[PDB]
Protein backbone atom coordinates (compact mmCIF):
# COMPACT_ATOMS: atom_id res chain seq x y z
CA UNK A 1 0.00 0.00 0.00
CA UNK A 2 2.46 2.62 1.32
CA UNK A 3 5.94 1.15 1.90
CA UNK A 4 6.92 -0.26 -1.41
CA UNK A 5 5.93 3.01 -3.37
CA UNK A 6 7.81 5.21 -0.94
CA UNK A 7 11.18 3.45 -1.14
CA UNK A 8 10.92 2.56 -4.75
CA UNK A 9 9.71 5.41 -7.00
CA UNK A 10 11.15 3.39 -9.92
CA UNK A 11 7.57 1.89 -9.72
CA UNK A 12 6.28 5.27 -10.89
CA UNK A 13 8.27 4.54 -14.20
CA UNK A 14 8.06 0.79 -14.54
CA UNK A 15 4.21 0.71 -13.95
CA UNK A 16 3.65 4.41 -14.09
CA UNK A 17 1.43 4.33 -10.94
CA UNK A 18 0.84 7.87 -9.80
CA UNK A 19 1.65 8.00 -5.94
CA UNK A 20 -0.87 6.67 -3.28
CA UNK A 21 -2.18 9.52 -1.20
CA UNK A 22 -3.72 7.36 1.59
CA UNK A 23 -4.58 4.01 3.17
CA UNK A 24 -7.41 3.45 5.76
CA UNK A 25 -7.37 0.94 8.71
CA UNK A 26 -10.64 -0.31 10.03
CA UNK A 27 -12.01 -3.09 12.22
CA UNK A 28 -11.76 -2.71 16.01
CA UNK A 29 -9.50 0.23 17.21
CA UNK A 30 -6.70 -0.17 19.84
CA UNK A 31 -5.69 -3.60 18.44
CA UNK A 32 -2.46 -2.22 17.48
CA UNK A 33 -3.32 0.29 14.78
CA UNK A 34 -0.65 2.65 16.18
CA UNK A 35 1.82 -0.25 16.15
CA UNK A 36 1.23 -1.05 12.52
CA UNK A 37 1.87 2.56 11.68
CA UNK A 38 5.23 2.38 13.56
CA UNK A 39 6.05 -0.89 11.85
CA UNK A 40 5.86 0.73 8.49
CA UNK A 41 7.73 3.80 9.74
CA UNK A 42 10.61 1.66 10.76
CA UNK A 43 10.73 -0.07 7.33
CA UNK A 44 10.91 3.10 5.16
CA UNK A 45 13.03 4.97 7.74
CA UNK A 46 10.35 7.65 7.93
CA UNK A 47 9.29 10.25 10.51
CA UNK A 48 6.35 8.94 12.64
CA UNK A 49 4.03 11.67 13.89
CA UNK A 50 0.99 10.79 15.92
CA UNK A 51 -2.08 13.05 15.89
CA UNK A 52 -4.84 12.21 18.39
CA UNK A 53 -8.29 13.10 17.33
CA UNK A 54 -9.03 15.08 20.38
CA UNK A 55 -6.46 17.64 19.13
CA UNK A 56 -8.95 18.37 16.41
CA UNK A 57 -12.09 20.52 17.23
CA UNK A 58 -13.08 22.56 20.30
CA UNK A 59 -16.37 24.39 20.17
CA UNK A 60 -15.43 27.24 17.77
CA UNK A 61 -12.35 26.30 16.07
CA UNK A 62 -8.98 27.71 15.30
CA UNK A 63 -6.52 25.82 17.24
CA UNK A 64 -7.95 22.65 15.61
CA UNK A 65 -7.11 23.93 12.18
CA UNK A 66 -3.74 25.32 13.31
CA UNK A 67 -2.38 21.92 14.14
CA UNK A 68 -3.42 20.18 10.92
CA UNK A 69 -1.21 22.84 9.26
CA UNK A 70 1.61 22.36 11.78
CA UNK A 71 1.95 18.60 11.28
CA UNK A 72 1.47 18.94 7.40
CA UNK A 73 4.48 21.35 7.58
CA UNK A 74 6.62 18.94 9.79
CA UNK A 75 5.97 16.03 7.52
CA UNK A 76 7.07 17.95 4.36
CA UNK A 77 10.19 19.24 6.33
CA UNK A 78 10.89 15.60 7.45
CA UNK A 79 10.04 13.57 4.25
CA UNK A 80 9.69 10.47 3.92
CA UNK A 81 7.02 10.69 6.72
CA UNK A 82 4.19 8.72 8.06
CA UNK A 83 1.33 10.54 9.91
CA UNK A 84 -0.73 8.14 11.99
CA UNK A 85 -4.31 9.50 12.15
CA UNK A 86 -6.33 8.08 15.01
CA UNK A 87 -9.37 8.43 15.14
CA UNK A 88 -11.56 9.59 12.26
CA UNK A 89 -14.77 10.96 13.75
CA UNK A 90 -13.81 14.37 14.92
CA UNK A 91 -12.40 15.53 11.58
CA UNK A 92 -14.05 13.20 9.11
CA UNK A 93 -17.63 12.08 9.72
CA UNK A 94 -21.11 12.38 8.02
CA UNK A 95 -22.72 15.65 7.35
CA UNK A 96 -26.11 17.10 8.21
CA UNK A 97 -28.33 17.86 5.10
CA UNK A 98 -30.37 20.42 7.09
CA UNK A 99 -27.88 22.12 9.47
CA UNK A 100 -27.01 21.84 13.04
CA UNK A 101 -24.81 24.08 15.37
CA UNK A 102 -22.27 21.41 16.29
CA UNK A 103 -21.57 20.23 12.74
CA UNK A 104 -20.21 23.57 11.56
CA UNK A 105 -17.10 23.28 13.60
CA UNK A 106 -16.45 19.76 12.45
CA UNK A 107 -16.78 20.75 8.83
CA UNK A 108 -14.25 23.58 9.05
CA UNK A 109 -11.52 21.29 10.41
CA UNK A 110 -12.47 18.82 7.66
CA UNK A 111 -12.07 20.84 4.50
CA UNK A 112 -8.38 21.16 5.46
CA UNK A 113 -7.83 17.44 5.75
CA UNK A 114 -9.52 17.00 2.31
CA UNK A 115 -7.36 19.73 0.69
CA UNK A 116 -3.81 18.84 1.82
CA UNK A 117 -4.07 15.09 0.97
CA UNK A 118 -4.39 16.13 -2.66
CA UNK A 119 -2.15 19.17 -2.22
CA UNK A 120 1.27 17.34 -2.02
CA UNK A 121 3.59 17.31 -5.03
CA UNK A 122 6.40 14.61 -4.98
CA UNK A 123 8.38 17.58 -3.86
CA UNK A 124 7.91 16.60 -0.18
CA UNK A 125 6.38 13.10 0.31
CA UNK A 126 3.47 12.95 2.85
CA UNK A 127 2.01 9.45 3.15
CA UNK A 128 -0.70 8.95 5.73
CA UNK A 129 -2.28 6.06 7.52
CA UNK A 130 -5.83 6.55 8.85
CA UNK A 131 -7.59 4.63 11.48
CA UNK A 132 -11.17 4.68 12.71
CA UNK A 133 -13.84 2.72 14.78
CA UNK A 134 -15.58 1.47 11.58
CA UNK A 135 -16.06 2.93 8.01
CA UNK A 136 -19.84 3.26 8.49
CA UNK A 137 -19.40 6.51 10.55
CA UNK A 138 -17.31 7.96 7.80
CA UNK A 139 -18.27 10.11 4.83
CA UNK A 140 -17.38 8.60 1.29
CA UNK A 141 -15.84 12.01 0.43
CA UNK A 142 -12.57 10.97 1.99
CA UNK A 143 -12.92 7.30 1.03
CA UNK A 144 -12.32 8.35 -2.61
CA UNK A 145 -8.97 7.14 -4.01
CA UNK A 146 -6.26 9.70 -3.81
CA UNK A 147 -7.79 10.40 -0.41
CA UNK A 148 -7.90 6.74 0.63
CA UNK A 149 -6.89 4.48 -2.18
CA UNK A 150 -7.52 1.29 -0.36
CA UNK A 151 -8.61 -0.05 2.98
CA UNK A 152 -7.13 -2.78 5.28
CA UNK A 153 -9.41 -4.66 7.57
CA UNK A 154 -7.47 -4.96 10.77
CA UNK A 155 -9.67 -7.28 12.94
CA UNK A 156 -9.17 -8.72 16.37
CA UNK A 157 -6.21 -11.33 16.68
CA UNK A 158 -7.03 -14.99 15.80
CA UNK A 159 -6.62 -17.82 18.39
CA UNK A 160 -3.31 -18.85 16.77
CA UNK A 161 -2.59 -15.13 16.70
CA UNK A 162 -2.81 -14.53 20.42
CA UNK A 163 -0.30 -17.40 20.81
CA UNK A 164 2.30 -15.55 18.62
CA UNK A 165 1.86 -12.36 20.51
CA UNK A 166 2.19 -14.22 23.85
CA UNK A 167 5.40 -15.63 22.52
CA UNK A 168 7.00 -12.10 22.02
CA UNK A 169 6.65 -11.50 25.77
CA UNK A 170 7.52 -15.01 27.13
CA UNK A 171 11.05 -14.45 25.77
CA UNK A 172 11.64 -11.64 28.20
CA UNK A 173 10.41 -13.75 31.22
CA UNK A 174 12.96 -15.73 33.26
CA UNK A 175 12.25 -19.40 33.91
CA UNK A 176 9.25 -19.78 31.62
CA UNK A 177 8.45 -23.41 30.54
CA UNK A 178 5.15 -24.47 32.20
CA UNK A 179 3.40 -21.91 29.90
CA UNK A 180 0.68 -23.44 27.63
CA UNK A 181 0.19 -20.59 25.08
CA UNK A 182 -2.98 -22.24 23.69
CA UNK A 183 -4.91 -22.41 27.03
CA UNK A 184 -3.97 -18.90 27.94
CA UNK A 185 -5.32 -17.93 24.49
CA UNK A 186 -8.48 -19.80 25.04
CA UNK A 187 -9.30 -17.96 28.23
CA UNK A 188 -8.37 -14.61 26.49
CA UNK A 189 -11.22 -15.13 24.08
CA UNK A 190 -12.31 -11.98 22.28
CA UNK A 191 -9.24 -10.16 23.48
CA UNK A 192 -7.42 -7.65 21.32
CA UNK A 193 -3.57 -7.69 20.91
CA UNK A 194 -3.20 -4.88 23.36
CA UNK A 195 -4.84 -6.95 25.99
CA UNK A 196 -2.26 -9.70 25.54
CA UNK A 197 0.43 -7.25 26.15
CA UNK A 198 -1.15 -5.87 29.38
CA UNK A 199 -1.35 -9.41 30.89
CA UNK A 200 2.42 -10.01 30.39
CA UNK A 201 3.35 -6.86 32.36
CA UNK A 202 1.07 -8.07 35.13
CA UNK A 203 2.44 -11.69 35.12
CA UNK A 204 5.71 -10.10 36.25
CA UNK A 205 3.93 -8.18 39.05
CA UNK A 206 2.19 -11.37 40.34
CA UNK A 207 5.30 -13.24 40.42
CA UNK A 208 7.32 -10.66 42.42
CA UNK A 209 4.30 -10.56 44.77
CA UNK A 210 5.05 -14.20 45.47
CA UNK A 211 8.62 -13.17 45.92
CA UNK A 212 10.20 -15.18 42.94
CA UNK A 213 12.01 -14.53 39.67
CA UNK A 214 10.13 -17.46 37.96
CA UNK A 215 7.06 -16.57 35.91
CA UNK A 216 5.19 -19.64 34.74
CA UNK A 217 1.58 -20.67 34.84
CA UNK A 218 -0.04 -19.65 38.07
CA UNK A 219 1.20 -16.09 37.48
CA UNK A 220 0.06 -15.94 33.94
CA UNK A 221 -3.44 -17.33 34.67
CA UNK A 222 -3.89 -14.78 37.57
CA UNK A 223 -2.85 -11.99 35.14
CA UNK A 224 -5.39 -13.02 32.66
CA UNK A 225 -8.16 -12.66 35.28
CA UNK A 226 -6.97 -9.20 36.36
CA UNK A 227 -7.06 -7.60 32.93
CA UNK A 228 -9.12 -9.73 30.52
CA UNK A 229 -11.61 -11.66 32.62
CA UNK A 230 -14.22 -9.70 34.52
CA UNK A 231 -17.22 -10.47 32.27
CA UNK A 232 -20.05 -12.68 31.58
CA UNK A 233 -21.24 -10.98 28.36
CA UNK A 234 -24.81 -11.89 27.29
CA UNK A 235 -26.20 -13.88 30.37
CA UNK A 236 -29.01 -12.48 32.48
CA UNK A 237 -31.85 -12.56 33.64
CA UNK A 238 -33.95 -15.71 34.56
CA UNK A 239 -37.44 -14.72 35.85
CA UNK A 240 -39.82 -14.16 37.75
CA UNK A 241 -41.32 -13.46 34.30
CA UNK A 242 -38.83 -14.10 31.44
CA UNK A 243 -38.66 -17.74 32.33
Amino acid sequence: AVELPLLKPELFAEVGIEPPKGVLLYGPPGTGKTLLAKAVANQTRATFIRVVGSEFVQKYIGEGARLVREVFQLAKEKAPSIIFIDELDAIAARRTNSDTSGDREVQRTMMQLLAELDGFDPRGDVKVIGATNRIDILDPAILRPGRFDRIIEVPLPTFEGRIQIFKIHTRKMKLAEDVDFKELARITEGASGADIKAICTEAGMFAIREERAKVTMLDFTKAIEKVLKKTTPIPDLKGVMFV
Binding site: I234, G239, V240, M241, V243
Partner: protein, 242 residues
Protein backbone atom coordinates in the same frame (compact mmCIF):
# COMPACT_ATOMS: atom_id res chain seq x y z
CA UNK B 1 -31.35 1.68 28.28
CA UNK B 2 -32.43 5.47 28.41
CA UNK B 3 -34.73 4.98 25.53
CA UNK B 4 -35.60 1.28 25.54
CA UNK B 5 -37.43 1.76 28.74
CA UNK B 6 -39.56 4.68 27.60
CA UNK B 7 -42.32 2.39 26.36
CA UNK B 8 -43.94 -1.00 26.97
CA UNK B 9 -43.43 -1.95 23.36
CA UNK B 10 -39.54 -1.79 23.19
CA UNK B 11 -37.10 -4.52 23.96
CA UNK B 12 -33.42 -3.97 24.72
CA UNK B 13 -30.52 -5.88 23.05
CA UNK B 14 -30.62 -8.00 26.33
CA UNK B 15 -34.31 -8.74 25.52
CA UNK B 16 -35.66 -7.35 28.74
CA UNK B 17 -38.95 -5.46 29.07
CA UNK B 18 -37.78 -2.71 31.36
CA UNK B 19 -41.21 -1.06 31.69
CA UNK B 20 -42.47 -4.36 33.13
CA UNK B 21 -39.42 -4.60 35.62
CA UNK B 22 -40.25 -0.99 36.61
CA UNK B 23 -43.99 -1.85 37.14
CA UNK B 24 -42.47 -4.54 39.41
CA UNK B 25 -40.42 -2.10 41.49
CA UNK B 26 -43.89 -0.49 42.02
CA UNK B 27 -44.78 -3.78 43.83
CA UNK B 28 -41.63 -3.24 45.97
CA UNK B 29 -42.81 0.39 46.81
CA UNK B 30 -45.83 -1.17 48.46
CA UNK B 31 -45.88 -2.82 51.90
CA UNK B 32 -45.04 -6.59 52.38
CA UNK B 33 -47.87 -9.22 51.86
CA UNK B 34 -47.06 -12.88 52.65
CA UNK B 35 -48.70 -16.23 51.74
CA UNK B 36 -47.77 -19.70 53.11
CA UNK B 37 -49.27 -22.92 51.67
CA UNK B 38 -49.64 -25.93 53.97
CA UNK B 39 -51.47 -29.17 53.39
CA UNK B 40 -54.25 -28.43 55.97
CA UNK B 41 -54.96 -24.95 54.47
CA UNK B 42 -53.48 -21.86 53.07
CA UNK B 43 -52.70 -18.64 54.83
CA UNK B 44 -52.86 -15.05 53.75
CA UNK B 45 -51.24 -12.44 56.06
CA UNK B 46 -51.46 -8.87 55.04
CA UNK B 47 -49.81 -5.80 56.40
CA UNK B 48 -52.38 -3.43 57.74
CA UNK B 49 -50.15 -0.82 59.09
CA UNK B 50 -50.89 2.78 59.28
CA UNK B 51 -47.96 5.41 59.09
CA UNK B 52 -49.87 8.27 60.85
CA UNK B 53 -52.51 7.85 63.56
CA UNK B 54 -55.19 10.10 61.93
CA UNK B 55 -55.53 7.28 59.36
CA UNK B 56 -58.36 4.84 59.74
CA UNK B 57 -56.98 1.38 59.10
CA UNK B 58 -60.07 -0.53 57.95
CA UNK B 59 -59.28 0.40 54.33
CA UNK B 60 -55.46 0.15 54.40
CA UNK B 61 -56.16 -3.54 53.89
CA UNK B 62 -54.85 -5.88 51.22
CA UNK B 63 -57.32 -8.74 51.77
CA UNK B 64 -60.20 -8.85 49.36
CA UNK B 65 -62.90 -11.57 49.31
CA UNK B 66 -63.16 -12.78 45.75
CA UNK B 67 -65.15 -16.05 45.99
CA UNK B 68 -66.44 -17.74 49.13
CA UNK B 69 -63.25 -19.86 49.39
CA UNK B 70 -60.84 -17.66 47.42
CA UNK B 71 -59.39 -14.65 49.11
CA UNK B 72 -56.41 -12.76 47.67
CA UNK B 73 -53.89 -10.11 48.57
CA UNK B 74 -52.24 -7.38 46.53
CA UNK B 75 -49.04 -5.17 46.37
CA UNK B 76 -48.41 -2.24 43.83
CA UNK B 77 -50.61 0.86 43.12
CA UNK B 78 -53.64 0.95 45.40
CA UNK B 79 -55.55 2.20 42.32
CA UNK B 80 -54.36 -0.51 40.00
CA UNK B 81 -55.18 -3.08 42.61
CA UNK B 82 -58.78 -2.24 43.25
CA UNK B 83 -59.74 -2.20 39.57
CA UNK B 84 -57.86 -5.39 38.96
CA UNK B 85 -59.33 -7.23 41.79
CA UNK B 86 -62.84 -6.04 40.96
CA UNK B 87 -62.29 -7.64 37.58
CA UNK B 88 -61.36 -10.78 39.41
CA UNK B 89 -64.46 -10.68 41.61
CA UNK B 90 -66.60 -10.52 38.37
CA UNK B 91 -64.63 -13.12 36.66
CA UNK B 92 -65.09 -15.59 39.66
CA UNK B 93 -68.85 -14.81 39.63
CA UNK B 94 -69.14 -15.23 35.81
CA UNK B 95 -67.58 -18.63 36.05
CA UNK B 96 -70.46 -19.63 38.40
CA UNK B 97 -72.99 -18.11 35.89
CA UNK B 98 -72.06 -20.30 32.90
CA UNK B 99 -71.09 -23.47 34.82
CA UNK B 100 -73.02 -23.38 38.19
CA UNK B 101 -69.94 -24.34 40.20
CA UNK B 102 -67.41 -22.09 42.04
CA UNK B 103 -64.29 -21.03 40.17
CA UNK B 104 -61.03 -22.87 40.55
CA UNK B 105 -58.10 -20.89 42.07
CA UNK B 106 -55.98 -21.77 38.97
CA UNK B 107 -58.46 -20.72 36.29
CA UNK B 108 -58.96 -17.34 38.03
CA UNK B 109 -55.13 -16.94 38.00
CA UNK B 110 -55.03 -17.74 34.25
CA UNK B 111 -57.86 -15.28 33.46
CA UNK B 112 -56.30 -12.47 35.48
CA UNK B 113 -52.86 -13.14 33.89
CA UNK B 114 -54.47 -12.76 30.54
CA UNK B 115 -56.15 -9.55 31.48
CA UNK B 116 -52.90 -8.05 32.42
CA UNK B 117 -51.23 -9.36 29.17
CA UNK B 118 -53.41 -7.28 26.76
CA UNK B 119 -52.39 -4.23 28.75
CA UNK B 120 -48.66 -5.34 28.45
CA UNK B 121 -49.08 -6.01 24.70
CA UNK B 122 -51.09 -2.95 23.58
CA UNK B 123 -48.80 0.06 23.38
CA UNK B 124 -51.64 2.50 23.86
CA UNK B 125 -52.03 1.47 27.44
CA UNK B 126 -49.67 0.82 30.38
CA UNK B 127 -49.66 -2.50 32.33
CA UNK B 128 -51.15 -2.84 35.82
CA UNK B 129 -48.41 -2.08 38.17
CA UNK B 130 -49.52 -4.79 40.63
CA UNK B 131 -48.85 -8.50 41.48
CA UNK B 132 -51.52 -10.58 43.29
CA UNK B 133 -51.07 -13.45 45.73
CA UNK B 134 -54.06 -15.63 44.97
CA UNK B 135 -54.94 -17.95 47.81
CA UNK B 136 -57.78 -20.32 47.99
CA UNK B 137 -58.72 -23.99 48.26
CA UNK B 138 -60.73 -25.47 45.44
CA UNK B 139 -60.55 -29.01 46.62
CA UNK B 140 -56.81 -28.99 47.22
CA UNK B 141 -55.01 -25.99 48.68
CA UNK B 142 -53.41 -23.45 46.19
CA UNK B 143 -51.06 -20.40 46.31
CA UNK B 144 -50.13 -18.46 43.20
CA UNK B 145 -48.28 -15.37 42.41
CA UNK B 146 -49.10 -13.33 39.27
CA UNK B 147 -46.38 -11.02 37.91
CA UNK B 148 -47.23 -7.57 36.44
CA UNK B 149 -47.10 -8.92 32.84
CA UNK B 150 -49.31 -12.01 33.54
CA UNK B 151 -46.65 -14.66 34.31
CA UNK B 152 -47.64 -17.51 36.70
CA UNK B 153 -45.47 -19.22 39.28
CA UNK B 154 -46.95 -21.66 41.77
CA UNK B 155 -45.53 -21.27 45.33
CA UNK B 156 -45.42 -22.93 48.65
CA UNK B 157 -44.12 -19.96 50.71
CA UNK B 158 -44.02 -16.53 49.22
CA UNK B 159 -44.26 -12.84 49.60
CA UNK B 160 -44.49 -9.72 47.28
CA UNK B 161 -43.84 -6.17 48.47
CA UNK B 162 -41.08 -4.36 50.38
CA UNK B 163 -40.12 -7.21 52.76
CA UNK B 164 -40.08 -9.89 49.94
CA UNK B 165 -36.34 -10.53 49.76
CA UNK B 166 -36.00 -11.05 53.48
CA UNK B 167 -39.24 -13.27 53.62
CA UNK B 168 -37.73 -15.41 50.87
CA UNK B 169 -34.58 -15.93 53.09
CA UNK B 170 -36.75 -16.64 56.12
CA UNK B 171 -38.79 -19.44 54.50
CA UNK B 172 -35.59 -20.87 53.00
CA UNK B 173 -34.61 -21.83 56.52
CA UNK B 174 -37.86 -22.13 58.57
CA UNK B 175 -40.65 -23.23 56.23
CA UNK B 176 -41.15 -26.94 56.34
CA UNK B 177 -43.64 -29.09 54.41
CA UNK B 178 -45.11 -30.69 57.57
CA UNK B 179 -46.16 -27.50 59.49
CA UNK B 180 -49.66 -27.69 60.86
CA UNK B 181 -52.11 -24.96 60.09
CA UNK B 182 -51.67 -23.59 63.66
CA UNK B 183 -47.98 -23.99 63.58
CA UNK B 184 -47.61 -22.35 60.20
CA UNK B 185 -49.85 -19.42 61.25
CA UNK B 186 -47.23 -18.39 63.94
CA UNK B 187 -44.38 -18.95 61.58
CA UNK B 188 -46.01 -16.61 59.07
CA UNK B 189 -46.41 -13.92 61.79
CA UNK B 190 -42.60 -14.48 62.58
CA UNK B 191 -41.97 -13.91 58.89
CA UNK B 192 -44.06 -10.61 59.02
CA UNK B 193 -42.35 -9.48 62.35
CA UNK B 194 -39.00 -9.88 60.67
CA UNK B 195 -39.69 -7.88 57.54
CA UNK B 196 -41.42 -4.95 59.34
CA UNK B 197 -38.29 -4.97 61.63
CA UNK B 198 -40.14 -4.80 64.93
CA UNK B 199 -42.68 -6.94 66.90
CA UNK B 200 -46.29 -6.72 65.93
CA UNK B 201 -49.46 -5.31 67.48
CA UNK B 202 -52.67 -6.88 66.12
CA UNK B 203 -53.93 -3.39 64.89
CA UNK B 204 -51.16 -3.22 62.25
CA UNK B 205 -51.77 -6.61 60.68
CA UNK B 206 -54.84 -8.45 59.19
CA UNK B 207 -55.15 -12.20 58.65
CA UNK B 208 -57.52 -13.96 56.43
CA UNK B 209 -57.47 -17.56 55.45
CA UNK B 210 -58.94 -20.59 53.62
CA UNK B 211 -58.67 -23.93 55.26
CA UNK B 212 -59.33 -27.25 53.38
CA UNK B 213 -61.74 -28.75 55.96
CA UNK B 214 -63.93 -25.71 56.25
CA UNK B 215 -63.52 -24.67 52.59
CA UNK B 216 -64.69 -21.07 53.52
CA UNK B 217 -63.13 -17.84 53.84
CA UNK B 218 -63.23 -16.34 57.16
CA UNK B 219 -61.65 -13.16 58.23
CA UNK B 220 -59.74 -12.91 61.51
CA UNK B 221 -61.19 -10.36 63.84
CA UNK B 222 -58.75 -8.64 66.30
CA UNK B 223 -60.14 -10.74 69.22
CA UNK B 224 -59.40 -13.92 67.30
CA UNK B 225 -56.09 -12.53 66.17
CA UNK B 226 -54.33 -12.16 69.46
CA UNK B 227 -53.32 -15.79 70.68
CA UNK B 228 -51.42 -16.23 67.47
CA UNK B 229 -49.75 -12.82 67.62
CA UNK B 230 -48.69 -13.44 71.30
CA UNK B 231 -46.79 -16.59 70.29
CA UNK B 232 -45.29 -14.79 67.41
CA UNK B 233 -43.98 -11.80 69.29
CA UNK B 234 -41.85 -14.02 71.49
CA UNK B 235 -39.79 -15.21 68.53
CA UNK B 236 -39.89 -11.94 66.57
CA UNK B 237 -37.94 -10.31 69.30
CA UNK B 238 -35.28 -13.19 69.33
CA UNK B 239 -34.53 -12.78 65.60
CA UNK B 240 -33.96 -9.03 66.32
CA UNK B 241 -30.98 -10.12 68.49
CA UNK B 242 -29.44 -12.09 65.71
Amino acid sequence: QMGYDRAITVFSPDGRLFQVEYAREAVKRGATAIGIKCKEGVILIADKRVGSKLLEADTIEKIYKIDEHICAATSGLVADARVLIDRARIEAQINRLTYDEPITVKELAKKICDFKQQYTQYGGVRPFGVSLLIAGVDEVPKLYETDPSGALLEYKATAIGMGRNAVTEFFEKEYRDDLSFDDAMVLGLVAMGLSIESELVPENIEVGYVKVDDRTFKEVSPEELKPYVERANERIRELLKK
